[PDB]
Write a protein that binds this ligand. Structure first.
Ligand SMILES: [Ca+2]
Ligand SMILES: [Ca+2]
Length: 460
């Protein structure tokens, strides 16, 4: 089965089990693309989100997201929204759990209602705004251009507007849609959002800074990460006729002149042989060799993008108005051929609510994880930590804890659930990060208690 057909038969595994989740997911897919279209390219995101009830009785909602991003070349629009791929190795951090991305919303839209999706886009420095009304052919997995136009652009405008009409359920999805937006804002203080909901409520999320974290850079795949099927994709993807040596050193990370030489012998392949002429045994051998070689450099972290200690603290402070906040961005680690970094943050006191458990905010590649929190490896680590060792004395406290995992391979427990898996190496690092911030909080609490006792005992 193709991704598209599998989606249609198993929507509940792709984030679309019912209209409420469909509505929530469509909103996230659009906001996520708009962020990746802006901040990754050095643009402060100005994002507008509107949801309108367009058919009361059948509960169809129109979701519109507008950004000031880099836009999309006109010739790329149809496929970007209306052609699902038959299978991409990730070499750059991107926002989103689901492989189909916005295409899942498009499919769902075309499967349950009749309006086309509406797109208006203008690439940087384009003299035109290009308009489209499109559908995806639900049987052929191909774009249908219903309408294609263009209008004159204005000075310095660039960006994209996307409108998709879908079955939805606002009352059910409402709280989690707001929470999604709120949590996105917390770690994206350099973005400005406007949200108008179907009831006509408007919420404004002002830009708090103009500092944008460093962008992800595409990297070549690291050998520990590739499967045969992946190799014979980089192979049939070459424009030149490389030699096997020519190919290990130019299409992979951490393979230099000398390392390739070794790999070649280990795998019993000849440098001079041309890669296109490999065999299902020469390959098997390469992969097994890859999996068994112990002298590779760790997967480069250039492909990752952190929120940053400053931005995490800025967001926690501005949104929660705590007495104290702290954060840590850990040094990169790696697992199964992919780099990963954990960042963590804590906010304590102030206007934050009293309760018997901390508020736990989970992020993966800069995206909120909203559902399935109790099965997530982050919840597990937070619950297992004994906060009394860190200065928390009462069984009721006011604390927010945040954890961000970024990687080119986030391990999820199950398709259609937003919970990160308990991979040992990742769990270990999440615990190390939380402890680092928990110790900053312990120091805060100990200094505060000392100041209080001093005033009580020494001041009149
Ligand atoms: Ca995405
Ligand atoms: Ca505990």
């Amino acid at each position: 089965l193709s991704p598209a057909e599998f989606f249609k038969r198993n929507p509940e595994l792709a984030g679309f089990p019912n209209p409420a989740r469909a509505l929530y997911q469509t909103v996230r897919e659009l906001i996520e693309n708009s962020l990746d279209a802006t901040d990754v390219h050095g643009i402060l995101p100005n994002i507008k989100i509107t949801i309108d009830l367009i058919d009361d009785a059948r509960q169809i909602y129109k979701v519109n997201v507008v950004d000031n991003g880099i836009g999309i070349p006109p010739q790329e629009v149809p496929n970007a929204f209306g052609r699902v791929l038959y299978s991409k190795y990730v070499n750059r951090q991107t926002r989103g759990m689901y492989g189909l991305g916005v295409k899942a919303a498009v499919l769902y839209s075309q499967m349950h209602q009749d309006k086309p999706i509406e797109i208006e886009t203008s690439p940087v420095n384009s003299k035109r705004i290009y308009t489209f009304k499109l559908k995806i052919d639900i049987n052929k997995n191909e774009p249908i251009i219903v309408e294609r136009g263009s209008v004159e652009n204005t000075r310095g405008f660039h960006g994209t507007s996307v409108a998709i009409s879908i079955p939805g359920d606002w009352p059910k999805a409402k709280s989690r849609i707001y929470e999604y937006i709120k949590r996105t804002y917390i770690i994206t203080p350099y973005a400005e959002f406007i949200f108008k909901d179907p009831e006509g409520n408007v919420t404004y999320y002002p830009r708090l800074t103009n500092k944008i974290p460093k962008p992800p850079q595409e990297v070549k795949p690291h050998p520990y990460g590739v499967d045969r099927e992946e190799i014979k994709i980089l192979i049939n993807n070459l424009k030149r006729d490389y030699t096997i040596k020519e190919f290990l050193v130019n299409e992979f990370q951490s393979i230099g002149d000398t390392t390739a030489d070794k790999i070649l012998e280990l795998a019993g392949l000849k440098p001079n042989k041309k890669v296109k002429n490999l065999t299902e045994e020469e390959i098997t051998r390469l992969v097994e060799t890859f999996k068994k070689y112990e002298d590779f450099r760790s997967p480069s972290a250039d492909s990752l993008s952190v929120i940053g200690e400053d931005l995490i603290e800025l967001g926690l402070k501005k949104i929660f108005n705590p007495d104290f906040a702290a954060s840590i961005t850990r040094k990169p680690k790696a697992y199964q051929g992919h780099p990963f970094i954990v960042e963590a943050g804590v906010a304590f006191g102030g206007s934050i609510p009293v309760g018997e458990e901390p508020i736990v905010l989970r992020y993966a590649n800069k995206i909120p994880l909203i559902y399935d929190e109790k099965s997530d490896v982050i919840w597990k680590v937070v619950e297992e930590l004994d906060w009394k060792r860190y200065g928390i004395e009462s069984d009721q406290y006011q604390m927010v804890v945040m954890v961000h995992l970024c990687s080119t391979k986030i391990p999820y427990k199950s398709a259609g659930k937003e919970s990160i898996a308990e991979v040992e190496d990742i769990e270990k690092e999440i615990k190390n990060a939380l402890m680092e911030v928990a110790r900053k909080l312990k120091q805060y609490l100990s200094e505060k208690r000392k100041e209080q006792e001093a005033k009580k005992k020494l001041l009149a």
